[PDB]
Amino acid sequence: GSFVEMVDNLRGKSGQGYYVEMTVGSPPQTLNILVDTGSSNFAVGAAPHPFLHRYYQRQLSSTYRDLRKGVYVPYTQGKWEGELGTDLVSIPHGPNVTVRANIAAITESDKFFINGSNWEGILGLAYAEIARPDDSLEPFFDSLVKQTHVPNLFSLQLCGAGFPLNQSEVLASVGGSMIIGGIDHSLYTGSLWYTPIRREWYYEVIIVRVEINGQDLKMDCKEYNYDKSIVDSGTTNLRLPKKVFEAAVKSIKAASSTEKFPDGFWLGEQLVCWQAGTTPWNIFPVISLYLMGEVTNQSFRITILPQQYLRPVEDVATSQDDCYKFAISQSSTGTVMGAVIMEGFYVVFDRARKRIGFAVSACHVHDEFRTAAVEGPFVTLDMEDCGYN
């Protein structure tokens, strides 16, 4: 495929989310919307807030329709309360369509909006099963497909810079692409490998093996999907079930033991800094997650580098050091393949064929010695057994 119009239509970074420009209402009100594959509600700030430079003003939209229904959405971190309605929505650097979609006008929120993020709403791209108040609230993408003939799939290339970006840089730089209704070959290298969406609620997948520098973590595979395993562009970190997280950290610490870091670093509580240009990437291991393939008894793996799991953060401390935060953390709600992981790959959410594709991203951060990878196939048995019920 080739959709130059939508190439480079995203802005943002892993720590604050990636967003796309949208317009809502009549006349059009331009708003930046966070792209969230871990939720299913389309919502926008609709009242003043310290972190919003603009918000949706329903009284100024002639096409706004009040559904007279309240709505509440809680997330792993953050939540908001709002009022449901519908209005006309367009995506300036997306397909040239206009759709009437459900919209949650956010009236109250806690730790949802983020200072300096530059986004004012969220686009839940997952399935109706998890939409609030319930699955009768049709998600944005479902309405787009029903009302237009846009192919039922979208792809994401989230681009991490590999270094900290200040406010102006995040505004003036391209954070990636969201190709709606297609796949753009200029966004990846090598071939696409697909894993099946286990169930249409979150974008759920099954991990069947984990390696740290080629060494098998060797845990019962059900543990890797303990509870569930999802792909979520709205989550910064690679998050792992508590037992997997402990085993993974023990193994990464052992591979990097030539240098010692405070416990707080491994808990994502503090940063580690190295003098300008001397980050010892080579001492950190690559991490491979093997995913169930589309072919029976077949799997493939995606491998990420420390350039993906060590998130660049500025050192307000005045210096030219390169600093980072450990971007893998524990979860009590299953595995979350967050932005840190998606930054290494072009990810195709093929809803039509109920599968998620991965290819090496043409914008992933790496060094001259190692690159992220997507490789297959591997003969793996009894994989369905890795799923938790």
Binding site: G17, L34, S40, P74, Y75, I130, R132, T236, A339
Partner: peptide
């Protein structure tokens, strides 16, 4: 200063 997003509970 490092922000972090962790977007639904079900």
């Amino acid at each position: 200063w490092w922000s972090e997003v962790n977007x639904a509970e079900f």
